[PDB]
Design a protein around this nucleic acid. Structure first.
Ligand SMILES: [Mg+2]
Length: 52
RNA sequence: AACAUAAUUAAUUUCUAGACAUCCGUUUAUGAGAGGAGAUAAGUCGUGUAAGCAUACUGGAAAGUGUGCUUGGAAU
């Protein structure tokens, strides 16, 4: 899932709310939270920030 | 070459990139060389076979001669 979101931001393409939702849902470790925090930041600064 | 992302406010991206690199041809002029027509004006030796037109030959090249035509000659 990380790869999909990274490609979208590289191409300046919108990311789905379901995509970020799946990431937070599948957090399995303390380290995973740190990565999810970065992607929540990226989602906020994206075209579909309102749809969180 | 022109897709796709997204979508419980709605928007984003796309909305291309190659290829003119340059002609064939075209006009103006520099102009070796060779004439033509003028300007300045004294030379040159010539100059009565009616004249002219067209044409041919011969004239160091005004002319002469042939052939037809014309009177813009003469002719009781
Ligand atoms: Mg003659």
């Amino acid at each position: 899932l990380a790869s999909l979101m990274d490609k979208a931001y590289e191409r300046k393409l919108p990311v789905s709310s379901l995509s970020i939702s799946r990431f937070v849902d599948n957090i399995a470790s303390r380290e995973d939270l740190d990565s999810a925090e970065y992607y929540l930041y990226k989602f906020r600064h994206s075209p579909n920030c309102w749809y969180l």
